[PDB]
Design a protein around this ligand. Structure first.
Ligand SMILES: O=c1ccn([C@@H]2O[C@H](COP(=O)(O)OP(=O)(O)O)[C@@H](O)[C@H]2O)c(=O)[nH]1
Ligand SMILES: *[C@@H]1O[C@H](CO)[C@@H](O)[C@H](O)[C@H]1NC(C)=O
Ligand SMILES: *[C@H]1O[C@H](CO)[C@H](O)[C@H](O)[C@H]1NC(C)=O
Ligand SMILES: [Mn+2]
Lengths: 14, 537
């Protein structure tokens, strides 16, 4: 049961 | 102090001169390093690196700390830009915060800054250690860094995260400006002058480079293009995640060349420069935020609402190792990120905070149980500085943003009686792809749906997406209803009937939760797999 959008704790790239 | 004319190239020569590099060395000129045909010990090292750092450390450890990034491919007006001596270019203190960074990546960041930053601007490089475990980051780093004379390591003994570490760095900095960088960056040519010249011109400007991707697998640097490409600016979505979007047309029109700042609703917040005085005056960071998450969004709203401006300078290019997963342990769990977001929502977002609370159940709970802590110093700052409200921010800074309803008719989850799972939008969806069934978690997010006056079932975190009926699998598509002019198409209108069926008004069929993807089927009131609960959180 993912607790957020997959692997949050990172800034997404452009 | 204020001289006539423009700094000369001699006046701007860097702190350290890059040696001419071997063009056939790994990663040379910023090109891809493909780490293939590895022996059994090498394949072991690589998986150890990947699992320690969530990037290919095996690649990073074989690339020079001194690699050039090939020719300067920025726009011509960026390569030709001259900087006035009045107001003078301010000095800067570079602040790099790290927690268990690899040696190769931490020292290529430090080398990059020294090779690309004019000596006259670079007062000091502060390395803030947020309680790293790795022994090589203790005495080994202290000693190695002495040769550079202006590099200092400052120690956060107990793990408190990125926010506390930056405040530590700032408190020892004596530069006129602070330039924050992550510990896995590489500076492009001429990256510093355009940030520091913009602050010299306008000291309430908080300025970011046009951040380039360094590939986590090959360490390839994505180089700027010389012909005025698509730029990105920062945004937020209604889960308060940072995001990237295209520039609006009015901003393209306003910007006559690439030396003009880009006005950005939010900033990524790892890589930026600010006046030291302004950083302190505008409320540095909320000291009660922990580990990671929310501070960039909090700082975006606070700068804009309190009379500053958030800008991206495309003549300033810095590469960043973007990761898909954090390598970082969370001492008291990822709940920390949601607490940080509630703290910024309570202080800055006024009534709009409810849009976020509805979508992140964990945040709604933190509000209800009042575990988000004392924000009185942040409230006091917003009052003393006479900051504008969030209605002003949305109108004046981010007028392009989709704003959900403050009080939607209904919000919650769609639970299937048959299989006892929830309609889920899946791992990756922004258009086109089928949806899934997933265990009901009650967290909102990917299980969040609204019901509209016009019979739409919305998933509206990022875009205004609508459940869209089809002969086969159901889709999320852009709502065709978007206010005054437009209507609601039948493929996006649903009736939740007395038998708990979801009945599409166009196709006269019913959503079933059978198969991998929910699809439309002939309406069977006895089929448990066509029976939906519209549950509130
Ligand atoms: O508890 C922490 C977590 C992160 N960092 C540092 O903060 C910066 C930003 O974190 P990261 O790069 O993991 O986040 P992202 O860039 O993916 O948002 C990096 O230089 C990290 O080494 C830190 O000092 N303490
Ligand atoms: C917010 O400020 C705007 C103008 O900037 C004003 O019109 C509005 O009444 C204010 N909103 C609240 C909620 O006070
Ligand atoms: C986590 O991701 C899964 C897919 O792997 C589901 O979409 C789930 O709903 C997600 N969780 C949240 C909170 O959105
Ligand atoms: Mn980073």
């Amino acid at each position: 049961a993912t607790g957020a959008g997959a692997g949050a704790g990172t800034t997404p790239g452009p | 102090h204020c001289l006539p004319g423009h700094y000369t190239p001699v006046e701007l020569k860097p702190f350290l001169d890059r040696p001419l590099q071997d063009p056939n060395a790994p990663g040379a000129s910023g090109k891809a390093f493909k780490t293939i045909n590895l022996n059994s010990e090498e394949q072991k090292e690589k998986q150890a690196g990947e699992e320690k750092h969530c990037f290919n450390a095996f690649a990073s450890d074989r690339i020079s700390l001194h690699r050039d990034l090939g020719p300067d491919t920025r726009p011509p007006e960026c390569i030709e830009q001259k900087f006035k001596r009045c107001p003078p270019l301010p000095t800067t203190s570079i602040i790099i915060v790290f927690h268990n960074e690899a040696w190769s990546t931490l020292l290529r960041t430090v080398h990059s800054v020294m090779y690309t930053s004019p000596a006259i601007l670079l007062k000091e490089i502060i390395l803030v250690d947020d309680a790293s475990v790795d022994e090589y980051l203790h005495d080994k780093l202290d000693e190695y860094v002495k040769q550079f004379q202006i590099v200092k390591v400052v120690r956060q003994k107990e793990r408190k995260g990125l926010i506390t570490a930056r405040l530590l760095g700032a408190s020892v900095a004596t530069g006129e400006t602070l330039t924050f960088l992550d510990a896995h960056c590489e500076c492009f040519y001429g990256w510093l002058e355009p940030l520091l010249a913009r602050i010299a011109e306008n000291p309430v400007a908080v300025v970011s480079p046009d951040i380039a991707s360094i590939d986590l697998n090959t360490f390839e640097f994505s180089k700027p293009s010389p012909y005025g490409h698509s730029h990105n600016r920062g945004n937020f979505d209604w889960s308060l995640s940072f995001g990237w979007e295209s520039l609006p047309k009015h901003e393209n029109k306003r910007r006559k060349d690439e030396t003009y700042p880009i006005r950005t609703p939010t900033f990524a917040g790892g890589l930026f420069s600010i006046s030291k005085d302004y950083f302190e005056y505008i409320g540095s960071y909320d000291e009660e935020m922990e580990i990671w998450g929310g501070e960039n969004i909090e700082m975006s709203f606070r700068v804009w609402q309190c009379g500053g401006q958030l800008e991206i300078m495309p003549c300033s290019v810095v590469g960043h190792v973007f990761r898909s997963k954090s390598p970082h342990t969370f001492p008291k769990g990822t709940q920390v990120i949601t607490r940080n977001q509630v703290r910024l929502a309570e202080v800055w977002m006024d009534e709009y905070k409810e849009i976020f609370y509805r979508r992140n159940t964990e945040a709604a709970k933190i509000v209800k149980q009042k575990t988000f802590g004392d924000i009185s110093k942040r409230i006091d700052l917003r009052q003393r500085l006479q900051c504008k409200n969030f209605t002003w921010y949305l109108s004046n800074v981010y007028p392009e943003a989709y704003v959900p309803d403050l009080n939607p008719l209904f919000s919650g989850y769609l639970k299937n009686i048959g299989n006892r799972m929830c309609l889920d939008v899946g791992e990756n969806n922004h258009g086109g792809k089928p949806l899934i069934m997933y265990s009901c978690h009650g967290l909102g997010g990917n299980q969040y749906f609204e019901y509209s006056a016009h019979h739409e079932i919305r998933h509206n975190i990022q875009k205004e997406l609508c459940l869209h009926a089809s002969k086969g699998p159901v889709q999320l598509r852009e709502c065709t209803y978007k206010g005054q002019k437009t209507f609601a198409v039948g493929e996006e209108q649903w009736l939740h009937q007395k038998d708990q069926t979801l009945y599409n008004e166009a196709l006269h069929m019913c959503l079933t939760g059978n198969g991998e993807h929910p699809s439309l089927a002939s309406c069977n009131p006895s089929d448990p797999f066509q029976k939906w609960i519209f549950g509130q959180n």
